[PDB]
Scaffold this active site. Structure first.
Site, mmCIF file in Angstrom:
data_model
loop_
_atom_site.group_PDB
_atom_site.id
_atom_site.type_symbol
_atom_site.label_atom_id
_atom_site.label_comp_id
_atom_site.label_asym_id
_atom_site.label_seq_id
_atom_site.Cartn_x
_atom_site.Cartn_y
_atom_site.Cartn_z
ATOM 1 N N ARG A 1 -1.001 2.550 -7.771
ATOM 2 C CA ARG A 1 -0.686 2.445 -6.342
ATOM 3 C C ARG A 1 -0.768 3.875 -5.716
ATOM 4 N NH1 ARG A 1 0.531 -1.609 -2.789
ATOM 5 N NH2 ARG A 1 0.987 -0.794 -0.697
ATOM 6 N N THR B 1 0.821 -2.951 15.525
ATOM 7 C CA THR B 1 1.332 -4.004 16.396
ATOM 8 C C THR B 1 1.922 -5.137 15.531
ATOM 9 O OG1 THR B 1 -0.563 -3.616 17.779
ATOM 10 C CG2 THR B 1 0.826 -5.493 18.310
ATOM 11 N N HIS B 2 3.134 -5.562 15.877
ATOM 12 C CA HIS B 2 3.882 -6.523 15.084
ATOM 13 C C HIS B 2 4.265 -7.663 16.021
ATOM 14 C CE1 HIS B 2 6.744 -7.907 12.018
ATOM 15 N NE2 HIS B 2 7.552 -8.168 13.032
ATOM 16 N N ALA C 1 7.827 5.247 6.619
ATOM 17 C CA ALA C 1 8.033 4.979 5.223
ATOM 18 C C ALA C 1 8.394 3.515 4.912
ATOM 19 C CB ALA C 1 9.048 6.005 4.606
ATOM 20 N N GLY C 2 7.682 3.043 3.899
ATOM 21 C CA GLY C 2 7.657 1.667 3.464
ATOM 22 C C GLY C 2 7.943 0.642 4.542
ATOM 23 N N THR C 3 8.972 -0.137 4.263
ATOM 24 C CA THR C 3 9.379 -1.222 5.131
ATOM 25 C C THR C 3 9.965 -0.799 6.518
ATOM 26 O OG1 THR C 3 10.012 -3.550 4.754
ATOM 27 C CG2 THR C 3 11.774 -1.904 4.241
ATOM 28 N N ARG D 1 -1.418 -3.693 3.453
ATOM 29 C CA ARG D 1 -0.745 -2.961 2.411
ATOM 30 C C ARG D 1 0.152 -1.928 3.031
ATOM 31 N NH1 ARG D 1 -2.438 -4.932 -2.404
ATOM 32 N NH2 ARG D 1 -4.659 -5.596 -2.443
ATOM 33 N N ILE D 2 1.298 -1.715 2.387
ATOM 34 C CA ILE D 2 2.201 -0.627 2.745
ATOM 35 C C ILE D 2 1.407 0.654 2.609
ATOM 36 C CG2 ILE D 2 4.281 0.721 1.878
ATOM 37 C CD1 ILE D 2 5.051 -1.795 3.602
ATOM 38 N N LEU D 3 1.409 1.453 3.668
ATOM 39 C CA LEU D 3 0.781 2.807 3.610
ATOM 40 C C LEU D 3 1.787 3.778 2.973
ATOM 41 C CD1 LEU D 3 -0.985 2.575 7.105
ATOM 42 C CD2 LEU D 3 -2.231 2.871 4.958
#
Ligand SMILES: CN1c2c(O)nc(N)nc2NC[C@@H]1CNc1ccc(C(=O)N[C@@H](CCC(=O)O)C(=O)O)cc1
Ligand SMILES: CN1c2c(O)nc(N)nc2NC[C@H]1CNc1ccc(C(=O)N[C@@H](CCC(=O)O)C(=O)O)cc1
Ligand SMILES: [Cl-]
Ligand SMILES: [Cl-]
Ligand SMILES: [Mg+2]
Lengths: 206, 205
Positions: free
Chosen positions: B71, B114-115, B148-150, B97-99
């Site tokens: 990863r 955009t979410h 960062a992540g989530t 994918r999580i950047l």
């Protein structure tokens, strides 16, 4: 307390740029004869018209690209070194498009200047002329100021007003402001070289 | 206090994994006076977004997770593949994918997404199904900086969207994409023109 920047005439001047080079051109035309500075190098972060004008005037161009350093902090470290290698007395940001970071300003605060086409602290941002026009002021102007950690925020060096005419559009207003902006920058560079500058609080006297 | 400068005329790289509908709104808008151009599309798989990118003659790079040993290795490689195009802004447009921290260490502040919910409500990949199952009457879309992540980075723009009686996932999702497309295209232009300043969690352009 105060910050004293000593006289430096005949000054070694570095211009930082990313765009058209027209302020750069204005400074190359003026720095001849007894004008108390010469442009020793131009720093850019990308291919641009300013780099071309510099090379055509036989001025060394150094390139520091954000894509070639692992982050913004490491780019700050590298632009700082590449600039210092020329040992400037004054740095003009003339269409430069990166924020100068803590390391750069640690070295060059007091000696770095920018121009803006409004009478700061009115109308900061990229739309200073259009905003002044929408706001309906009758008087706008041009500002030269020291670069600090914020954008458009540094101690002011010189200002001159410019009238807004009835029926002015952005373009006609901007060009009127640019005529004054050019002279102000040219006079400010000469004055800083000749007399240096003192800064008390946020007030800069030659 | 994060400060990102203006970049008009901006180089945009859009990262995508799926349909390419957000991407297509950007491609179509980003001409003329629009303060940006799409210079490359990055994908981590074959998808309609990559095909739509070739139709408009935009370079596509592909960095597939399976083609790297870890990863971490993938994260370095996608960051380098992106940096090669010298972007001013990275738009996540259905990128799946999580950047990773290497990508964010280069691009944090210049990466946006955009979410299809009004953050902080219904984060994650099923924000629409979740908003529907919860029975809210008002959902929406959020353009935000990626972090960062989530975690949800500073919100750039938001706009609400009603939930109607009898909606299922699909009709509600379609209603929100209509708003997502406009909001994204407006936010990219503002970010390009004005840059962004962040005080606390609050972003201003
Ligand atoms: C925009 N968003 C996002 C994000 O918010 N943060 C990072 N670091 N990277 C990314 N990349 C793509 C996108 C959303 N992707 C995901 C993928 C998985 C999850 C999850 O497990 N919940 C949540 C979001
Ligand atoms: C000079 N200024 C500045 C600053 O004030 N402080 C720091 N630390 N660093 C910097 N670096 C450069 C600059 C801040 N950043 C920018 C970056 C880009 C723009 C910009 O594109 N401006 C438009 C016109 C708008 C304008 O007059 O700013 C252009 O002509 O290019 C305007 C400002
Ligand atoms: Cl006047
Ligand atoms: Cl609503
Ligand atoms: Mg300016």
């Amino acid at each position: 307390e105060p910050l004293r920047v000593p006289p430096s005439a005949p000054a070694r001047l570095v211009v930082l740029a990313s765009g058209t080079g027209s302020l750069l051109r204005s400074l190359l035309d003026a720095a001849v004869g007894d004008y108390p500075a010469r442009v020793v190098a131009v720093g850019v972060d990308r291919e641009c018209r300013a780099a071309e004008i510099a090379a055509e005037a036989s001025v060394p161009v150094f390139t520091v690209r954000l894509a070639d350093h692992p982050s913004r902090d490491a780019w700050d470290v590298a632009i700082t070194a590449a600039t210092a290698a020329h040992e400037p007395d004054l740095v003009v940001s003339a269409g430069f498009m990166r924020i100068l970071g803590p390391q750069f300003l640690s070295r060059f605060y007091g000696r770095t200047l920018n121009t803006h086409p409004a009478l700061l602290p009115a109308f900061p941002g990229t739309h200073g002329v259009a905003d002044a026009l929408a706001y309906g002021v009758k008087v706008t102007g041009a500002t030269v100021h020291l670069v600090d950690a914020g954008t458009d925020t540094g101690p002011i060096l010189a200002q001159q007003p410019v009238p807004v005419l009835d029926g002015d559009d952005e373009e006609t207003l901007h060009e009127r402001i640019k005529v004054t902006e050019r002279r102000l920058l040219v006079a400010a560079v000469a004055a800083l070289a000749t007399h240096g500058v003192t800064v008390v609080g946020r007030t800069a006297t030659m």
